[PDB]
Design a protein around this ligand. Sequence first.
Ligand SMILES: Nc1nc2c(ncn2[C@@H]2O[C@H](COP(=O)(O)OP(=O)(O)O)[C@@H](O)[C@H]2O)c(=O)[nH]1
Ligand SMILES: [Mn+2]
Length: 601
Amino acid sequence: IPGLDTAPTNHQGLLSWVEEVAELTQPDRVVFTDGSEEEFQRLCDQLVEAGTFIRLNPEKHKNSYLALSDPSDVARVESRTYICSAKEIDAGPTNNWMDPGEMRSIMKDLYRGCMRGRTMYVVPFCMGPLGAEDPKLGVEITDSEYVVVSMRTMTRMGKAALEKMGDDGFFVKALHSVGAPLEPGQKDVAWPCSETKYITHFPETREIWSYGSGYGGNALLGKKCYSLRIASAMAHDEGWLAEHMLILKLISPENKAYYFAAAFPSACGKTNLAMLQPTIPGWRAETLGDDIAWMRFGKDGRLYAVNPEFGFFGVAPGTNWKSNPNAMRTIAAGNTVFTNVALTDDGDVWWEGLEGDPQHLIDWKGNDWYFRETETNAAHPNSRYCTPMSQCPILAPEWDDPQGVPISGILFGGRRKTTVPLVTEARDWQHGVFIGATLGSEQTAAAEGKVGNVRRDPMAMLPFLGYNVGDYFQHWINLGKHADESKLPKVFFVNWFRRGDDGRFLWPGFGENSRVLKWIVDRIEHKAGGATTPIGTVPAVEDLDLDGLDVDAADVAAALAVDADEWRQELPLIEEWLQFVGEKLPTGVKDEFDALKERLG
Ligand SMILES: Nc1nc2c(ncn2[C@@H]2O[C@H](COP(=O)(O)OP(=O)(O)O)[C@@H](O)[C@H]2O)c(=O)[nH]1
Ligand SMILES: [Mn+2]
């Protein structure tokens, strides 16, 4: 195809693969992306010409755009996401599995001719800092320009990644199509997609095949498909960890930095914590990431984290100058693509929770929206901003260092109205794994439906594991067993969402979570107490710095209470979950569960 002839690499495996894909999908032309600022502008000008992008008032925003999607293509589709390992047991009970030969036959049928009437982009990229010994590289082939521009922000895309591949370097093969072939002469739509959607991962060959969605983690294949699904399977095989964790640098009033990694499920506070503004005099906070952490042991035996991503793909609604000024400042520097937010009368963007009460807006469907009248949200409730990390004012200077940052503490947490204390320190590594493995959160989904349950979401990875959950637990246990336990991060479990009898929050959270992290630091520095309980070490209210905090000590005590009775009721929920994990549940997790049972009596 034209002009693969004119392509800036001698990597023959790449060229072949591009040719084989093009022969199948039959695009009008193939274009290799270089990631320059020039190309970005051209792509964006095209997308504006197509009507997919609206340019935002340049007086208010530097080089920014609003994109609106088809309302059928508005989120990740977990019921259409598949781990297609050779054996169903290697996908495991948390994944949808399909026999790989079966899946290939479905997807090859779907891909045949699917790019008719479009450009096929070949997008090389790097996950992690460019300057690594063996960086993790990929190529995404896509027929969406939206995808290319988003990939440019969310990954290290283009010329530099293509050069790192050399002539025979390995890379992850990622194929994407929106699945909306055009007939000759046919007018295209602003957001092409298909009613048939598949997001498929082949862990053994390290390939991702996506079809039919233009949106988010369905289409930006670095963001979840590579960074967690494929990466988790590589990490399992190569001796490291790919996780759903923010990375936070906390700096004490003396001049000491502590790095923490925290795994909360979506909607449980990762973005807030990752951009924490501490409330205790002299403490500062910087971010390395609010989503993905890749972690590996160094020569000295410590665990080092790196963010593989290069941008933030944040949920917009709720974001404002009070809730997250640092997120706001990042967006204010421009170079941002908003997806599915509302457009103001002066060509700015708005969404629910932002300052102002615009009386009229154009909503994310392109319809007129009116204050105290229009029954639908102006911004889609899961709309996004896509912005460069380098614009974040509290970004840590080590954010682009390939050797990463040494982790002191790993935090697990989710939303629990009852039972789980504000903070608890694990007893050892194995116990740590167990706390992670049984993380519970009170949240449910539209097509889960019912309602008040406690979802189990092991390390915050329920939708993202690239292999059997039991073998993942084992992998965590093994990394601990084979390490020097003095160099290992300590493990904590937090809960910001415990409620009193009248149902208010016992803990105020947000900035004040800096006080919980201070206890954690103090435990690392042998400066704070905590009582041994059935579920781990938990501070008394006296062990915590509440100086300056306008809250009832009775509330804090209640937020910290470990009640044997509540915990006994938790045990059959946990038991059901561990039975679900099935035959690959490790003995180590069952042993911890037996220990927990013994201590609760
Ligand atoms: N009560 C309470 N709510 C919080 C806290 N941190 C975040 N939230 C809320 O939980 C939701 C999710 O926060 P976000 O930080 O975007 O979580 P993410 O999806 O994991 O990034 C938002 O409605 C936040 O206001 C906290 O410490 N306490
Ligand atoms: Mn977030």
